[PDB]
Amino acid sequence: ANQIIGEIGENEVRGRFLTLGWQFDGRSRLEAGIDGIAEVMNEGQPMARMIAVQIKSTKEGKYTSESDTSFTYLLRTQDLAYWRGSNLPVIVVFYRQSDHSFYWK
Amino acid sequence: TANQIIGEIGENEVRGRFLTLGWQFDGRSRLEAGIDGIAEVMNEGQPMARMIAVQIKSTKEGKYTSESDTSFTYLLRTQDLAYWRGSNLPVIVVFYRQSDHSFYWKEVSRDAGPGERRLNIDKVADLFNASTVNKLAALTVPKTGLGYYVPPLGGGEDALINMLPLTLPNEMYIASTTYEPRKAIAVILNGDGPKRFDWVINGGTFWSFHDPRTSACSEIVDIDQVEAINTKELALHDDIDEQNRFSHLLRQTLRYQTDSDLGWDKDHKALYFRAIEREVSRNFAYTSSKKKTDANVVSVFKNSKDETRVSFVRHHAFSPRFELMADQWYLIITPTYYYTTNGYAPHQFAAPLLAGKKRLDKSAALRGQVIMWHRFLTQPEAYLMFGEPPSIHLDVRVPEDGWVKEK
Amino acid sequence: ANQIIGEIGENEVRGRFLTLGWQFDGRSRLEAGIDGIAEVMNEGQPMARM
Amino acid sequence: EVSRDAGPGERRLNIDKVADLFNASTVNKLAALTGEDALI
Amino acid sequence: TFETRIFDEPELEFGDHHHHQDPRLGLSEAGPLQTFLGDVIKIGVVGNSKTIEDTRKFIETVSSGVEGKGEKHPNMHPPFPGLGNQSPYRCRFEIEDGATAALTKSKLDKIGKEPDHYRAVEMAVDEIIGELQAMDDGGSRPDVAIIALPVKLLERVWNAKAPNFRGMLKAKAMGLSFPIQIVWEDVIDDKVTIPQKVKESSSRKIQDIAGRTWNLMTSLYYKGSGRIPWRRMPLEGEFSACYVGISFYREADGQQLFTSAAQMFDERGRGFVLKGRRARTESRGRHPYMAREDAKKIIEDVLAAYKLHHKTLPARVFILKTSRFKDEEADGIIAALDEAGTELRDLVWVQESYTARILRDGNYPVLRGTFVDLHGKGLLYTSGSMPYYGTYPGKYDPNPLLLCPHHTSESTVAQLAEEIFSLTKVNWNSTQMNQRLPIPIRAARKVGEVLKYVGEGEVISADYRKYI
Amino acid sequence: SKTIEDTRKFIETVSSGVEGKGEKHPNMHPPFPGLGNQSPYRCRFEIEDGATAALTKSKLDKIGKEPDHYRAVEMAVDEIIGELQAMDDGGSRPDVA
Amino acid sequence: RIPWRRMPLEGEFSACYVGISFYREADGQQLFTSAAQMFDERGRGFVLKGRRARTESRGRHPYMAREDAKKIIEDVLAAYKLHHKTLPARVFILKTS
Amino acid sequence: FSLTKVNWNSTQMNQRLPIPIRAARKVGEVLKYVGEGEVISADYRKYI
RNA sequence: AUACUGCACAGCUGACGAU
DNA sequence: ATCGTCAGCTGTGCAGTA
DNA sequence: ATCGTCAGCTGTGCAGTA
Ligand SMILES: [Mg+2]
Ligand SMILES: [Mg+2]
């Protein structure tokens, strides 16, 4: 059940991304950590070269210490050391099933 | 450009619409131009090894060929039809609308049958969504049907229940009585003023909810003061005969105090709708807001050819019972008809008249009958206040959305 | 490295399928047992056989 | 390949190394589915 | 709000350990649970010369694939596969040339003058049993018997104008090796303008020529071979249980009332056993309620019949009775139980009405098995809409049978509801799916309906093959 | 029996997230996140069917009939201990009872 | 969890298998008795276990007496009846003496 | 003869003694050095 | 009477109490 | 002792096969 | 084996979860 919510969250986050362009590949099933590679569209032509994006989807339910204005997320230092040693910026998003709260960090 | 990108975002959104009820849409390379990835039907964590071939067109924005909210008289080509018939898997047609992000599918296969020009009548009730998904399950299984089938595809729908909860009044009144019931009916019948009969008398005491000097006189009751007891202390130790006496109390309460006072049948049970005048129609449209008012209550049915003779007139009837289901009451309904030839003289052939419509087809009006009957009774003192039955939740639905309606 | 050998085995199976000109397209890891879909063509005859 | 005959399934598939090859020879086979005397 | 559960449809065991919820499909796909050694069944027949011959052509013609009522909805009336090389029973059935009975046409008009009807049923059934005994005396014994009655011999024995039929002739036939099977000519002939008794109508419309042969043959196969068609499966963790059910039948005229009972349990290998009891069930009272003695006797009998076969004692006892569970006999039941030593106990009562009539949103009625717990009284819908069929077999107002367990029982009501839902289509009569009243009370009704007029001598055969 | 069914229902309900008490003092009542991917244990609990002890009503009736206070609690404790010991000796050993 | 077990036949009665064997005391010349009490589970399993007791010596003989043989069978029957909720129909005893 | 290869300490089919005799002998071998007053377990894994 | 479904109708049962 | 209230409990006939 | 003085440590139970 929780395995399909991540796939549908990735699919609809990509649909939001492909909404205004933002060419997203996703990954295969061999991936670990970082999700697929995306770019930025410029009025109909991929002017942007490359960037990295990671999906993070959760079910219905509020986050930690979420009271109508904010919430908090904690990052594992293995993942932080993974992204710090890289050659591309990364972005982190959140869930989509309460009222489609696609956020960027 | 425009069309290719809007088509690929359309297939992304219908992949999501596949994914929102299971239905793992596994894609493929685009090297066929007319079939998308293969969908696999799934049932709540268990794949069912059933696959459907999908194909998706580009987009639909604004009005188009005979576009409407319900009709949508759109016609497709004929070159693609053979291309959509030279296949083994059931290929389904998919379109996408950006106005409300909806998805069009109203055709699967016809087995080499040129049905007009591929009419796509959509949004009559619902498009490819959570509702009516068993129309997609019964596709690879043909009408031959040796042993294979498909279970209902999850869903989850609410449903009503037919007992109305009751909120009884606060007080109850008892007194001493040294009389007989045959004297009581005599003084009720031969008395002068108006009278009611919302009381009962047991062998030892009194049992009512009225004054020491009632509106229906005070001869049967004693000269002593009646005693005021709250209704929350009533027969809760033993002796279900006391529950029977409370049942007769509430029986006379419902019999001699109702809305638009009716007659009380003894053929089926309890009450039934009367006739306002000598053999006339009886509709009484009423509603509890929403958008639909009541349709019918009592109609007059005539002979087929002998126009000068009336066949019969039928009314609606039900019978409440007495159940203290965990210290909370419930009035239980049974919608039935009662037949007469004039509205007052009882019918001598009422047995096969209950059948017919009970025999012809499915229910198709029992929900409406339950709704109008629960709204009918919820409208000096009334001595009663009624409520609303609960709606229970089920994990399963009938696949009649994917089936064929009765003709 | 079980995922590595599974992925290279799937790719080589697809390569041997396709070097004879036979379509084969894999699926995601949300399945259980159905590792892919194959449709057959010979000299450009791709009927919708599954 | 596994059949669809009536009854139980057919486990324990035995595979030879002569006619089960995935070369160009066996391409169209799966495309047709549509006593003794002793002493003491 | 009210709590509820749903149940998936239980399967039925068949040959090759095969489990399926559709007994026609399971029989046609994996054969019977216990196959027969020889491929022969010999069937007797009583009738005039016209019924024997077209019975022979019926037996011949059903062996080539008589199809159903229609192509639409192909699964309530499935195609009969025949009696050759693909049979559901894997055996052949035939009429031997030593059971070809006929009836005299001489003793009619003075019966038609009608001085008395009780003497008429007496002489007719005495002649029938005399012929059957004369058939069983010789070396042409059949496994079953067809007692297809002559039309004038029936029309003037049922509506003879207080008679009784279909079971009194069995009640004076517990002495023959073959268990009889009365078949009215309605499908055997399938053309005659049969009357409709009281209402002067055309005929009784029955069905097409697939399901009739299906369930008739199934009943004939069980009654003839002695092997059993189906049973429900045990579960990996199930204990040992016996099912007893009690019905409350009337007198031969209806002043006193007596209580009938049934019994069933599993087998040591792969089987199922369903018996009655070869004893009288006299009243010792007039009001329709149990006694200590009868309940203790039936409990001791089911315990003895289980220990005779399994060499152990069951871990569970299940009782389904149609009246209140009071301590005047519950003391005897409980005392007999710990006299034996059975640990799990259940005591369930039925027939409480006007309790719940739950509806749904749409057009069709509720599904098959929507169970609700009404704070102790569990109501379940043994009938309803039914998804593998694709249709709704039924007219209107499906009755939700409920379970009122006695407070002595050790289980929850939902578990017992699931267990009884697994115990609906297990009786060996017909192939119909919907069975509201469970088998332990169904068989009790089926034995009491022949015990209500004769128990005076000729003790019953508890093999159940003369009860369907 | 009823305790076992309510225990299974309790586990099934609390595995799917639990709401907070209210907005008044939110840190006093934080919501339980359930045993999903947001679980604060990185493991999940399951109740295998191969070992589950249902207590018969005859023994509970005998427990509720003894007038002596000491030996009734002692025999209830010992019976439970014997059920758990036979649970442990077999091949259906649980992690926690 | 057990790796494999023998296939039970169809139609056989329920039974429990008890071995018997003996051993020495590693300093003096005596003999004990010790054994296992295996049987079949209610589901799909096999129960192979010893007993939580040590028999006394009672002479230098590889034969027991009529005071612990009854106790051993009583323990086997109690261990079977606690799990299957009924007594078995057959008892199989294997001995080296 | 059916109760021969149930012994889980080995994997050969060349087994002579049946399982209960082997289990009893191994149980006795481990039980030889246990003093009085100690804890003995019914678990078979403590003996093989 | 292949059965098993509802409907309609009829009879019977027990739980309380009298001028 | 039959009339009311309330709960069963057990017998007989039609139809339509979706 | 009792009675005032002071100084402190375990059982047993009820509200209230602010
Ligand atoms: Mg070792
Ligand atoms: Mg029959």
Numbering used by the authors:
A (entry chain N): 7 to 111
B (entry chain F): 6 to 384, 397 to 424
C (entry chain J): 7 to 56
D (entry chain J): 112 to 145, 161 to 166
E (entry chain E): 2 to 162, 179 to 485
F (entry chain M): 50 to 146
G (entry chain I): 244 to 340
H (entry chain I): 438 to 485
Paste lines from the article.
The short Argonaute-based bacterial defense system, SPARDA (Short Prokaryotic Argonaute and DNase/RNase-APAZ), utilizes guide RNA to target invading complementary DNA and exhibits collateral nuclease activity, leading to cell death or dormancy. Collectively, these experimental results led to a detailed working model of NbaSPARDA that highlights the importance of the transition in assembly form during the activation process. gRNA loading, tDNA engagement, and guide–target heteroduplex propagation lead to the “monomer-dimer-monomer-filament” transition of SPARDA complex.
The filament is composed of a backbone and an inner layer. The backbone is constituted by NbaAgo proteins, with the APAZ domains and guide–target heteroduplexes positioned at the periphery of the backbone. The filamentous backbone is formed in an open-ended domain swapping manner, and the intermolecular interactions occur at the MID–MID, PIWI–PIWI, and MID–PIWI interfaces in an asymmetric manner. Specifically, NbaAgo.1 and NbaAgo.2 are connected via the PIWI–PIWI interface, NbaAgo.2 and NbaAgo.3 via the MID–PIWI and MID–MID interfaces, NbaAgo.3 and NbaAgo.4 via the PIWI–PIWI interface, and so on. At the PIWI–PIWI interface, K324.1 forms charged interaction with E360.2, R287.1 forms charged interaction with E253.2, and R285.2 forms cation–π interaction with F256.1 and polar contact with the main chain of G254.1. In the structures of the guide-bound and inactive complexes, DREN domains are flexible; however, it becomes stabilized by forming tetramers with D2 symmetry at the inner layers of the active and substrate-bound complex filaments.
